[PDB]
């Protein structure tokens, strides 16, 4: 959950050196006033800065109030990025054209040490690649160590 808002705010800045707006969000005319009014209902002040800029966040540490809000935006298109945990991939149905899995490392309280992401996860996350109604093909992207590439 913590890496989420960290990755989300890192991208938000990484654009600020170069380009934002037209890349990150849509036209400012109508949609910004839609995003503004919907960004005033978010409970955690962290997200309020992100969600205004076009980067959403979905993790169980958020109340069901906002985790619905972040989807309604991202469903209608007002968000170009949604940084998530595995929680999205299981219960919620939220298709998108592209899905990036950043890092394969997860902690296993059984073994008391870090491990690699499991196949039934990796297969499950990429189930959200592509939207059946629109896109003729989905795209997954996996960013990991050289050793995992095997």
Partner 1 sequence: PEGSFKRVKPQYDEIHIPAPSKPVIDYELKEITSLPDWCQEAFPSSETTSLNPIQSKVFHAAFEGDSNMLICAPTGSGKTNIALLTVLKALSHHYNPKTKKLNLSAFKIVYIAPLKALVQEQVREFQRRLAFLGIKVAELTGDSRLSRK
Partner 2 sequence: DELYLYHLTLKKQTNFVHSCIGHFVDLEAGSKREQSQLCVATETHLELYDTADGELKLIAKFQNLFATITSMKSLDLPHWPTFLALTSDSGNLSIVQIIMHAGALRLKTLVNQPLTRTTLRRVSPISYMEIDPNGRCIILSSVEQNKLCFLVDYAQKLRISSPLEIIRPHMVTLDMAVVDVNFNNPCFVTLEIDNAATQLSVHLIFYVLELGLNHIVKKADYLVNPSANFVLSLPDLSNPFVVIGFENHILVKDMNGFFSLKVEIPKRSITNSRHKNVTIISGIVQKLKNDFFVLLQSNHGDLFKLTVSPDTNDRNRPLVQLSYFDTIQNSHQLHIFKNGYLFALSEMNNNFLFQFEKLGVEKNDFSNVLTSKDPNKSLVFEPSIKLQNLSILSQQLNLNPSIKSQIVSDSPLSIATKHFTNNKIITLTNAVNYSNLISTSLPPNATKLWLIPDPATTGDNNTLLFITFPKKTMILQIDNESMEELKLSQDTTIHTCLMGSHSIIQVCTAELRHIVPTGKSRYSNKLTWVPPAGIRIVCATSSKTQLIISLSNYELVYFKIDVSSDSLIELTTHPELDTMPSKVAIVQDTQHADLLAIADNEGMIKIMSLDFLTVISLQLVSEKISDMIMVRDSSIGQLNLHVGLENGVYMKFHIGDVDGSFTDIKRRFLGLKPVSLSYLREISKWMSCVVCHSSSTWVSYTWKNVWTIRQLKDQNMLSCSKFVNADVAINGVCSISSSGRLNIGRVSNFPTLDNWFHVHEMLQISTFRPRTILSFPNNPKSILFIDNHSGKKQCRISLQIDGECLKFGSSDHLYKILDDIDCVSAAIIDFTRQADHLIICAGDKRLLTYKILVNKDKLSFDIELLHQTEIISPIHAMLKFKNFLLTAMGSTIVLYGLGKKQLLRRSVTQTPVSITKIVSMHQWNYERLAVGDIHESVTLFIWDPAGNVFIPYVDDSVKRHVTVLKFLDEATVIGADRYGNAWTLRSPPECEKIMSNHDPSELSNGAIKYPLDVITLQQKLPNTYDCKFKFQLLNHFFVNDIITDFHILDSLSNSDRPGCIYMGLQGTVGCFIPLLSKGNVFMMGNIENIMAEADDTFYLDYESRKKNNIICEGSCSILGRDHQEYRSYYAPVRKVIDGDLCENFLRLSLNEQEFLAKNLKSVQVEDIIQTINEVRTNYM
User: Is residue 149 a contact residue for partner 1 (CB under 8 A)?
Assistant: yes
Q: Of 6, 77, 114, 115, which one interacts with partner 2 (CB under 8 A)?
A: 77
Q: Of 17, 19, 64, 91, which one interacts with partner 1 (CB under 8 A)?
A: 91
User: Is residue 78 a contact residue for partner 2 (CB under 8 A)?
Assistant: yes
Q: E strands along the chain, which residues? A: 55-58, 81-84, 98-102, 105-108, 113-116, 139-143
Q: Of 1, 3, 10, 34, which one interacts with partner 2 (CB under 8 A)?
A: 34
Q: Of 27, 37, 146, 147, which one interacts with partner 1 (CB under 8 A)?
A: 146
CA distance 3 to 35: 24
User: Is residue 133 a contact residue for partner 2 (CB under 8 A)?
Assistant: yes
Asked if residue 88 lies in contact with residue 124, where contact means CB atoms within 8 angstroms, the answer is: no
Q: Of 35, 75, 34, 41, which is closest to residue 54 (Cα–Cα)?
A: 35
CA distance 12 to 7: 9
The residue ranges that bind partner 1 (CB under 8 A) are 87, 90-91, 120, 123-124, 126-127, 132, 137, 139, 143, 146, 149
């Amino acid at each position: 959950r913590k890496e989420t808002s960290r990755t989300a705010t890192w991208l938000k800045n990484k654009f600020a050196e170069e380009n934002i707006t037209h890349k990150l969000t849509k036209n400012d005319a109508g949609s910004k006033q839609i995003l503004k009014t919907e960004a005033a209902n978010v409970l955690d002040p962290s997200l309020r800065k992100l969600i205004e800029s076009g980067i959403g966040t979905h993790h169980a540490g958020l109340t069901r109030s906002d985790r619905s809000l972040s989807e309604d935006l991202f469903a209608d298109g007002l968000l170009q990025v949604l940084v998530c945990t595995a929680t999205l991939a299981w219960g919620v149905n939220l298709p998108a054209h592209t899905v990036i899995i950043k890092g394969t490392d997860v902690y296993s309280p059984e073994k008391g040490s870090w491990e690699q992401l499991s196949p039934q996860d990796v297969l499950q996350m990429l189930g959200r690649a592509g939207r059946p109604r629109y896109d003729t093909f989905g795209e997954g992207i996996i960013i990991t160590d050289q050793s995992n590439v095997q």
